[PDB]
Amino acid sequence: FDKVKLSDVGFVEAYNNCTGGQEVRDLLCVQSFNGIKVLPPVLSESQIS
Amino acid sequence: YDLYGITGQGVFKEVKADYYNSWQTLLYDVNGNLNGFRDLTTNKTYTIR
């Protein structure tokens, strides 16, 4: 999980910095603004672990 | 907003930008969205989200 930035649990962390209006230069926040947002899977990554 | 003809809606966040030379005023991004703006009547800068 250290190597890959956009891991499974990291997506919602990457979505949580989108709403506040701070450092909004990344591309992931733009995709959610037009409906293309990644959803989490059913099982959490803690659960599979 | 209707900024000098450009129509759109969003927030305004005042940030002390730089290097808007003399003629170049409106800061577009790669995708043809409006991402930054300079007022001609106040010589101030903004960034739009």
Residues of chain B in contact with residue A33, where contact means CB-CB under 8 angstroms, are: none
Q: Report yes or no: A24 at the B interface, CB cutoff 8 Å.
A: yes
Question: What spatial distance separates the first Cα and last Cα of chain A, rounded to whole Å?
Answer: 12
Give A49 to chain B, closest Cα distance, Å.
38
Query: Experimental technique used?
Result: cryo-EM
Do strands B27-28 and B34-38 pair parallel, antiparallel, or not at all (unpaired)?
A: antiparallel
Give the CA distances from residue A2 to residues A15, A21, B8, in Å, rounded to whole numbers and listed in that order.
18, 26, 39
The first and second tokens of residue B1, run together, are 């907003």
Task: Identify the H or E element spanning B13.
Answer: strand B12-13
Is B28 strand, coil or helix?
strand
